[PDB]
Design a protein around this ligand. Structure first.
Ligand SMILES: [Cl-]
Ligand SMILES: [Cl-]
Ligand SMILES: [Mg+2]
Ligand SMILES: [Mg+2]
Ligand SMILES: [Mg+2]
Ligand SMILES: [Mg+2]
Ligand SMILES: [Mg+2]
Ligand SMILES: [Mg+2]
Ligand SMILES: [Mg+2]
Ligand SMILES: [Mg+2]
Ligand SMILES: [Mg+2]
Ligand code: NA
Ligand code: NA
Ligand code: NA
Ligand code: NA
Ligand code: NA
Ligand code: NA
Lengths: 160, 186, 140, 95, 154
RNA sequence: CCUGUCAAACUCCAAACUUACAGACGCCGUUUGACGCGGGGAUUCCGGUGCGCGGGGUA
RNA sequence: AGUGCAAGAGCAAAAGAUAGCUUGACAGUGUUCUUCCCAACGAGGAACGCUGACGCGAAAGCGUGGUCUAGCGAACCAAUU
RNA sequence: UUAGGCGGCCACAGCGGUGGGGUUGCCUCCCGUACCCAUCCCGAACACGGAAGAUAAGCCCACCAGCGUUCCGGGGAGUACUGGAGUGCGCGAGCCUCUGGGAAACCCGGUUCGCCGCCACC
């Protein structure tokens, strides 16, 4: 279904699993990628993807944009390139759908999403000065798969 | 101790000196408390009342200031106890105090104990206190008959210091008599 | 400084953990004073469901009653190292436990102003081995 | 509300912050008030007896005699006058 | 001492705000009152802050308005120096004005209506949709600011 | 140890704010009698909109 | 932890545990709050008294059932004291 | 207060730790079971009687901040949030200005190793 049905953060926070049952498993394969044995401090360049609008991103998008981004890195810096990217948000907000018309309309559980405040960093990659343009391209591909407009912000990296 | 959520007992409960649950049932009477306390060598009796910043003591008596009237024997036994009660009781009377409830603190309500002795004494001084006669020791044991007859099983003095050999519960009578007497500087 | 620091036997408890008695007979005869029934909490599949119900007996010995018991009890056991408590207590064996402590334990056992014994004033395995070993037998 | 009992919606007002947990000091449980005295009403989570209807937590009444050991405090619920039977443990002098 | 002037009508304004304007003796648009600077009064003017124009007037300005819009507790009697003198603890308007500004007395204590019923602002005001810091006419003003307004509502 | 996130039915914290009582100012009442009390007569118990805060619902 | 059962809350020289004793789960009659915020409305409920009689305790005191909020039913008629 | 008793507030008082202190004085530990009394077995405790010994426990006194707690400074922060107003912006979600209020986390540095009341007492 369209994200138009869940991208807004207008409903109450709905995460208490001791009261919600039948929550669909997350499609997000993994949050920490690249060389997870190495430290983020071991890198000169640190670029993050910043969400420009407070929104809700369904686990299906996180995975799609994460996937399309890491898949790019892997393709440019090899399956074991010197880098490590992180998806810092987790889809805690449970989603419903009323699928009687409006009678007893409290919807059944259909999924999960992560609430991201504008200005926050969704993804954060770490690389050597000679890969910045690749991680920047990965991020560009990733923000085409989420609702908000985003900033590809370079933090540690005065090597321009 | 452990964290922000940790609960520290009221100081006098950590100290294990005050039983606040009994303190409450006690305060309910609205009457002054006749605090009866013991020591290894001494016996104390205070008449306490509730105050804005803590309890106020209106009259007391310590087994030690018993000698100040002639007591020449030990000061941590039955005769000593009874007398300390009577003394504190008399001062209480002088202070305008007329009634009180017996507070024995963390002591045990054992029949014939010294606290009930401190109680019988205060009562005789003319203080009205809720009591039960058969929980008190028999007159003789209050005098010190139990200790005298104990020295009978002598062979060796019961008292190191030189206060007679067979002891004198008469000294008790003579002391009590002294207090009952109108004179005596309280 | 030492006198009020040198170990002493506070109590020697001798109990028989049976599970369903006639045992009380021998304990009284071996110790010198009456036994004590021993009930149990919780229920077990080992046909031991009855919460309150005799299962064992014990005897808490103090003073001579405890020594005169050890003067023969100890001689029947090969005391070891690991067999000692962190506080200087040791249980060997029919169970025979020995509780050792310093001259002021009453501070932690009395009703009024009771307090727990400072660690420095607590007993140690070594100090325990010493005291005992120093009384007709060997350590480890 | 889903139910309409007395303790409905009192999860907060009838519970102690962790540290104030446990039996309360006897002093205020035996305090004495005089008629005309303004007193604040506030249930002590640790004291079961002598309470009043939770709706009245926060009221500042006027002591007007007593019944047994409890006090009879006059208040005004909205525009209606009511008399509340409450013990000292749940009362504090105004000012 | 501040000069209060209602610039926005009662329709749709909160009742507690309206009742404050009335407790400050103003019941119509363009009416003005002189209020002391106390903790209590400050609270009231802050609450009315959005439908009123206020500030401290200049001695002169006050004098002009008093002469032109002051009224007895009853009647059409013009408040001129003579009137002021024959009825107040002062000798003239400036004497009264000075007293008001120094918060020594009030229009009532001198048998004067607590309200100065001003005239619409000649040339118009700066709008009742924005505050002064935004080119509007609502809220607190400079003495130079209030003066212009008051003098225009002469 | 280090490292990544959350809560309508979590809370070591914690507002703005609402609220009891009192005093002060203001306003009001003592020929326009307030506050309150007793009595006669109703109508009314399909509401709607804006804004703020909401709960449900893709809307 | 336990405290009969939802959930939330209370409780540690206890409101929990063990032991012992006991029948206040008593009769009568009220005050007050609740039911029904404000704001009228019954049954029911609770809190807090008093009179009478008791239980326990050294005593203050506690006991108007269960630590607290659910466990309830008019008139007419019948049986019962 | 050269060591006590009863408390109030109930961690600023907790947890942990160092140093000091007692011949007929105080509190203790301590000594001891004929008695009042006591252990479902133990004078361990409780109760009673008492001074050979001790300052090692407790307790009292002086002190340490590592943990927990209280408060304060500076920073975070007039940020987050928010009562009132707007023909201010934005497709919208939402934001902004004016006015009145104003956190929390964390960090750095200070504070806190109890305060006070009545009684008795070289
Ligand atoms: Cl004592
Ligand atoms: Cl009530
Ligand atoms: Mg709530
Ligand atoms: Mg006129
Ligand atoms: Mg024109
Ligand atoms: Mg215009
Ligand atoms: Mg509200
Ligand atoms: Mg009950
Ligand atoms: Mg019928
Ligand atoms: Mg029948
Ligand atoms: Mg020392
Ligand atoms: Na249907
Ligand atoms: Na996008
Ligand atoms: Na048995
Ligand atoms: Na409490
Ligand atoms: Na009823
Ligand atoms: Na010492």
């Amino acid at each position: 279904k369209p994200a138009s049905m869940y991208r807004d953060i207008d409903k109450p926070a709905y995460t208490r699993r001791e009261y919600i049952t039948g929550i669909p498993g997350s499609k997000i394969a993994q949050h920490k990628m690249g060389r997870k044995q190495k430290d983020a401090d071991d890198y000169p360049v640190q670029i993050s993807l910043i969400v420009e609008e407070t929104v809700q991103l369904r686990h299906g998008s996180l995975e799609a944009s994460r996937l399309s981004a890491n898949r790019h890195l892997i393709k440019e810096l090899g399956e074991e390139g010197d880098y490590k990217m992180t998806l810092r948000k987790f889809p805690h907000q449970v989603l419903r759908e009323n699928k009687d018309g409006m009678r007893a309309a409290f919807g059944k559980i259909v999924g999960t999403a992560a609430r991201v405040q504008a200005g926050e960093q969704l993804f954060t990659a770490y690389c050597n000065v000679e890969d910045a343009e690749h991680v920047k391209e990965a991020f560009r591909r990733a923000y085409n798969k989420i609702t908000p407009s985003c900033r590809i912000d370079s933090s540690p990296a005065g090597n321009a | 101790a452990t964290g922000p959520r940790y609960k520290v007992p009221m100081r006098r409960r950590r100290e294990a000196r005050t039983d606040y649950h009994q303190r409450l049932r006690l305060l309910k009477s609205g009457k002054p408390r006749l605090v009866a306390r013991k020591s290894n060598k001494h016996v104390r009796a205070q008449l306490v009342t509730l105050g804005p910043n803590g309890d106020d003591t209106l009259a007391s008596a310590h087994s030690s200031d018993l000698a100040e009237y002639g007591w020449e024997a030990p000061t941590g036994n039955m005769p000593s106890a009874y007398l300390t009660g009577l003394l504190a009781g008399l001062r209480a009377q002088e202070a305008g105090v007329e009634e009180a409830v017996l507070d024995i603190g963390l002591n045990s309500p054992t029949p014939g104990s010294k606290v009930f002795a401190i109680q019988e004494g205060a009562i005789d001084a003319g203080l009205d206190i809720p009591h039960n006669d058969d929980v008190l020791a028999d007159w003789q044991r209050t005098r010190g008959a139990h200790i005298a007859e104990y020295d009978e099983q002598l062979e060796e003095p019961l008292y190191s210091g030189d206060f007679d050999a067979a002891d004198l519960p008469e000294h008790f009578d003579e002391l009590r008599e002294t207090l009952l007497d109108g004179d005596i500087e309280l | 400084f030492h006198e009020m620091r040198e170990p002493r036997i506070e109590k020697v408890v001798v109990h028989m953990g049976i599970g369903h008695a006639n045992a009380e007979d021998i304990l009284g005869e071996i110790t010198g004073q009456m036994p004590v029934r021993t009930k149990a909490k919780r229920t077990v599949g080992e046909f031991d469901i009855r919460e309150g119900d005799p299962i064992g007996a014990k005897v808490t010995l103090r003073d001579e009653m405890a020594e005169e018991f050890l003067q023969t009890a100890l001689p029947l056991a090969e005391l070891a190292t690991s067999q000692f408590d962190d506080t200087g207590n040791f249980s060997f064996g029919l169970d025979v436990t020995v509780n050792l402590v310093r001259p002021g334990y009453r501070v932690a056992k009395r009703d009024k102003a009771s307090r727990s014994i400072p660690t420095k004033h607590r007993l140690n395995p070594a100090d325990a081995v010493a005291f005992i070993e120093s009384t007709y037998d060997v350590e480890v | 509300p889903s139910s309409n009992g007395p303790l409905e919606g009192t999860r907060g007002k009838l519970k102690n912050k962790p540290r104030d947990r446990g039996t309360s000091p006897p002093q205020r449980a035996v305090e004495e008030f005089d008629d005309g005295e303004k007193v604040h009403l506030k249930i002590d989570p640790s004291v079961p007896n002598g309470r009043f209807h939770p709706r009245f937590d926060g009221q500042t009444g006027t002591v007007e005699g007593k019944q047994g050991d409890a006090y009879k405090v006059d208040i005004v619920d909205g525009g209606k006058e009511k008399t509340i039977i409450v013990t000292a443990a749940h009362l504090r002098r105004q000012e | 001492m501040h000069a209060l002037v209602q610039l926005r009508g009662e329709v749709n304004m909160h009742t507690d705000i309206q009742d404050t304007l009335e407790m400050l003796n103003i019941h119509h648009v363009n009416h003005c009152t002189l209020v002391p600077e106390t903790d209590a009064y400050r609270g009231m003017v802050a609450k009315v802050n959005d439908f009123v124009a206020f500030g401290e007037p200049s001695q002169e300005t006050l004098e002009t308005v008093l002469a032109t819009r002051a009224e007895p507790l009853e009647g059409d009697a013009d408040v001129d120096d003579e009137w002021v003198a024959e009825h107040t603890d002062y000798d003239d308007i400036s004497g009264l004005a000075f007293a008001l500004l120094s918060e020594e007395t009030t229009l009532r204590e001198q048998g004067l209506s607590p309200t100065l019923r001003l005239h619409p602002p000649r040339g118009g005001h700066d709008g009742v949709k924005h505050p002064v810091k935004e080119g509007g006419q609502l809220g607190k003003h400079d003495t130079e600011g209030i003066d212009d307004l008051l003098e225009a509502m002469r």
